Amino acid sequence: SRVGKKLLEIPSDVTVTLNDNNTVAVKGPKGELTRTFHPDMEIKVEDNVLTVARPSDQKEHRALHGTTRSLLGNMVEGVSKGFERGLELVGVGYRASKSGNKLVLNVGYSHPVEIVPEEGIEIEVPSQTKVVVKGTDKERVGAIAANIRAVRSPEPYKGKGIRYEGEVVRRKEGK
Amino acid sequence: EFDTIKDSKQLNGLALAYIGNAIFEVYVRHHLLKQGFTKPNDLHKKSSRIVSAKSQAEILFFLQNQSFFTEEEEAVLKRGRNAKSGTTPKNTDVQTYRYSTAFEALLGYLFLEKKEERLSQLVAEAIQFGTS
Amino acid sequence: MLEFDTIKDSKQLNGLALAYIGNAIFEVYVRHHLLKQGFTKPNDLHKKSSRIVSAKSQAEILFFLQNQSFFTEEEEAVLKRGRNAKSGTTPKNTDVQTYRYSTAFEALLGYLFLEKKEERLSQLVAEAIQFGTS
Amino acid sequence: KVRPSVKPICEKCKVIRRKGKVMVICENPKHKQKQG
Amino acid sequence: WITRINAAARMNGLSYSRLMHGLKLSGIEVNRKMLADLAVNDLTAFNQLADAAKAQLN
Amino acid sequence: TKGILGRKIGMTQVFAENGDLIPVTVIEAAPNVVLQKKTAENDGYEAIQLGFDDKREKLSNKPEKGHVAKAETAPKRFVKELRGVEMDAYEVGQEVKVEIFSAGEIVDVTGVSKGKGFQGAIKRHGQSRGPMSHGSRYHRRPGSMGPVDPNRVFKGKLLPGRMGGEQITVQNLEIVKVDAERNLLLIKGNVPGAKKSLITVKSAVKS
Amino acid sequence: TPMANASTIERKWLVVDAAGKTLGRLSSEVAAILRGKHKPTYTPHVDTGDHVIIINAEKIELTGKKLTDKIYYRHTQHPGGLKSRTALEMRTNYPEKMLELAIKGMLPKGSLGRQMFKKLNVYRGSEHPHEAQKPEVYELRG
RNA sequence: AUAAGUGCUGAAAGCAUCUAAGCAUGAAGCCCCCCUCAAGAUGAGAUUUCCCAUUCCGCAAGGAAGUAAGAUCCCUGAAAG
Ligand SMILES: [Mg+2]
Ligand SMILES: [Mg+2]
Ligand SMILES: [Mg+2]
Ligand SMILES: [Mg+2]
Ligand SMILES: [Mg+2]
Ligand SMILES: [Mg+2]
Ligand SMILES: [Zn+2]
């Protein structure tokens, strides 16, 4: 089938707003979200109904026609409840802690590594061996978790370093 | 120390505007000097910007909305706008020239009556707005 | 006179800004004088002010004053600074040294005004107007 | 593993394109390879 | 001559490769490029020639 | 930043408190005087002018007299311009004394090298010689001019000509002692220039 | 016998805009307005052209992947010293120079062709200082 | 700002995907920062200060003569050659 053809509801507090040049925004119980779209593409919304009218078929139109819909879906979902992603931390003593608003991780390096997030996203730590990022949008938490993981990639010979909240790494043997 | 004139009300014509021209020019030039500029080219450019007919017209219109004036001020503004004289410049129309004449006449009448407390404040406000 | 305040570094202005403010000063004085003398017709006020506010009458007044042992050392320095300033485009119907000698006069007036030397400037422009009108 | 002839080895190697090049990506990184 | 005729026959909405065709068609106007050119010394007759040309191009 | 202008006088030595020898270059000065200010609304940068070592009134012309008579002082012989500086602690006529360098600071010293004349290659560019025996007829000559194929000489060869006399800047020197009375500046090391010459002592750019 | 005009010519200033136009397609009619091939009195050795002013020169465009793969080379006279610039850095920091180099390759090469090139006035903005010559407007014929 | 690489969201292809839209990171390389020369940059720039109320011919353009600020000739020399 196709994903650019499904439908999208709109909760009560979630209020979308159409504007010239197709630059829809959203007002919800967790913050705002604006994202300009392609000028050619047509966006049309009804109460509890989302529609993406596509012009004559082409190679790039069948792509944009799904991209915009997926983005609107992610947007309404984030403004409804928001996304998050945890970060397990195995170590043999590798431990993360909190300091004001920023993050500090004492990996095997010889000096503490500092990680500070941008505005609109917070970094919570529920325990000294786990990190959990929380934010409204999806690409933001994605990028923040990637930049936090890229401090210490997981070694394959033994689980050592940062890894995602649920993932399997391969294992060799060393003697 | 300018000795007073025999009367500052029988100047029915444009003499009020004639003096107000040079008064406003002195004020805006001294202000531009205080800002710091010294080259004559940009000094003259900004001076012309602030002293043009349309600029004075817009400043008068804007100050009209603030009710910054009193009764005799409206009296002298009217007496200035009832002036029919000369020919308007080729670059501008016949309407805004009358507003400029009114502003210049008001400035001249304020100057020629030793009311510097109103004059300095009025020109300070006019310059402040025109430099927006 | 007017109610101004001092400008920092008023002894460092080139020969042009001084004349720039002095032209306005002289215009104010001459217009107030022609109005005090008794006149209402703007045509005649222009036709008369264009007798004293031309570079020829200004150069003349300057030569008359200078040849009368009226000035002092600092006014002489301000005259030399006004006359030595080299810029502008000469007017189509005048010489190019009477122009300089009138710019010297306007620079003198402007430098006298920008230092709160009120009474000296007043008497100077008084004698200047008196000569020019005669 | 650069080579002018890329083709899957095991059954689970995919073939994609990036920036106008031919790449074979897989789960076992001994099989990852790129044409040119 | 060809450059000057091309310049003089574009302030009328034609070009050269169409003015010349319309002149060869509208009757047989045998005015040489030298004289047709020189007649841009005054631009009142050349406009008449160009109008007669533009007639036959429809 | 900050900086002054002085005269090289010659090298000497001083013992520190550790009791160790230190080469030292002496530089005299005087109260310099700010003669002009170059702001960004009149020019394209920020810079003050400094004067130094006044000269007697017979050796000055009328342009220079009039230029230096707007700060009410005497015709100065060396005029320069210190560009990168804060321009609110300086007024025309004000002075800039030697008392702005504390001990143990780090400065730069700009000066004109001393002339060597028309020098060859072995001395100018520090090249090598040929042999002096074994039948040779080659020593103290600048070498091959290059390959045959270009049919010309590449721009950038190194040949004899006039050496020295350029402008040079030494970096990361250090103040030893600042005699506030006699207007002296003891700088460690040596500085370019012949004795009795103009020397510019600015603050450190690298940091 | 044909009128060969010489020192009997007049000139007139024109204003051209570059907001939303392809390079090489603008500099191909400007480079023939300068040369004089729009005047019925065109003589080939007197430079019967006229002056052209260009504004909004930083709004020019290039099709395809030219803003990354159009290079501008320039060689010094020293060995090895071949310097290079791409089109993005040029259009960002030297727009007027980009347009001057464009137009300069479309003119004759002698000693009349490089005084035809003194009549071109390129600016990067929306205001020009030449408000005294009364410069009229000129929309592109194609 | 980039190279190779590592990417985050994301469809064509209901999944997957570093890319086609979009958002990053990433080298002794590249452009600045450091040092020197530089407006004959004929596109010959800017700033500050000195000199200017002459005399002849020439209807006029212009030409000529004495000069002003300043410079040079000539002489005593070297931190220069
Ligand atoms: Mg008026
Ligand atoms: Mg003047
Ligand atoms: Mg050896
Ligand atoms: Mg050759
Ligand atoms: Mg040819
Ligand atoms: Mg000796
Ligand atoms: Zn595989």
Using the structure, give the distance in angstroms from the CA atom of G51 to the C1' atom of H31, rounded to a whole number: 35
DSSP state of E14: -
- Judging contact as 3 or more Cβ pairs under 8 Å, the answer for B and F is yes
Long-range contacts of C63-67 (CB under 8 A, 24+ apart): C63/C101, C64/C131, C65/C124, C65/C127, C65/C128, C65/C131
**CB < 8 Å to F149, chain G:** none
Handedness of CA F41, F45, F51, F57 (dihedral sign): negative
- Comparing CB atoms, the residue among E7, E11, E38 nearest residue G2 is E38
Residues of B with CB under 8 A from a CB of C: 1-3, 5, 11-15, 18-19, 22-23, 25-26, 29-30, 33-34, 38, 40, 43, 85-86, 116, 120
Using the structure, give the distance in angstroms from the CA atom of G125 to the C1' atom of H45, rounded to a whole number: 21
DSSP state of A83: E
Planar angle of CA A43, A48, A49, nearest 5 degrees: 35
Helix/strand/coil (H/E/C) assignment for every residue in chain G: CCCCCCCCCCCCCEEEECCCCECCCCCCCHHHHCCCCCCCCCCCCCCCCCCEEEECHHHCECCCCHHHHCEEEEECCCCCCEEEEEHHHHHHHCHHHHHHHHHHCCCCCCCCCCCHHHHEEECCCCCCCCCCCCCEECCCCC
Enumerate neighbours of E (3 or more CB pairs within 8 A).
Answer: G
> Nearest Cα to G133, choosing from G17, G56, G52?
G52
* Burial category of A101 from C-beta neighbours within 10 Å (exposed 0-12, middle 13-18, buried 19 and up): exposed
The set of strand H positions with any atom below 7 Å of a protein CB reads: 5-24, 31, 34-37, 43, 46-53, 69-71, 79-81
* Burial category of E37 from C-beta neighbours within 10 Å (exposed 0-12, middle 13-18, buried 19 and up): buried
* Burial category of A142 from C-beta neighbours within 10 Å (exposed 0-12, middle 13-18, buried 19 and up): middle
Enumerate neighbours of F (3 or more CB pairs within 8 A).
Answer: B, C, G
Nucleotide nearest to C59 (CA to C1'): H53
Looking at the complex, report in whole angstroms how far the Cα of residue F66 sits from the nearest Cα belonging to chain C: 9
- Across the beta sheet with D14-17, the strand order is D2-3, D33-35, D22-25, D14-17
Residues of F with CB under 8 A from a CB of C: 37, 70, 92
Experimental technique: cryo-EM
Cβ neighbors of F65 (< 8 A, separation 6 or more) are: F57, F75
Query: Distance between alpha carbon F79 and the CA centroid of its chain, in Å?
Result: 13
Cβ neighbors of F119 (< 8 A, separation 6 or more) are: F160, F161, F162, F163
Strands F175-177, F167-170: pairing kind: unpaired
DSSP state of A18: -
**Per-residue CA distances from A123 to B71, E15, F138, G29, G127 (Å):** 66, 72, 77, 60, 50
Q: How much distance in Å is there from the Cα of F195 to the middle of ligand 6?
A: 11
Phi-psi region of F193 (alpha: psi -120 to 50; beta: other; left: phi over 0): left
Tokens 């909760």 locate to: A11
Look at chain B and report how many structural domains it folds into: 1
| Furthest-apart CA atoms within chain G: distance in Å | 56
Strands D14-17, D2-3: pairing kind: unpaired
- Comparing CB atoms, the residue among C17, C25, C41 nearest residue B38 is C17
The C-alpha atoms of residue A58 and residue A3 are separated, in whole angstroms, by: 17
**Residues spanned by the domain of A46:** 15-83
Strands F175-177, A113-115: pairing kind: unpaired
Looking at the complex, report in whole angstroms how far the Cα of residue B67 sits from the nearest Cα belonging to chain F: 37
The C-alpha atoms of residue A97 and residue A95 are separated, in whole angstroms, by: 7
Tokens 């006020």 locate to: C45
Tokens 């392609």 locate to: A38
SS3 E43: coil
Gyration radius from chain F CA atoms: 23
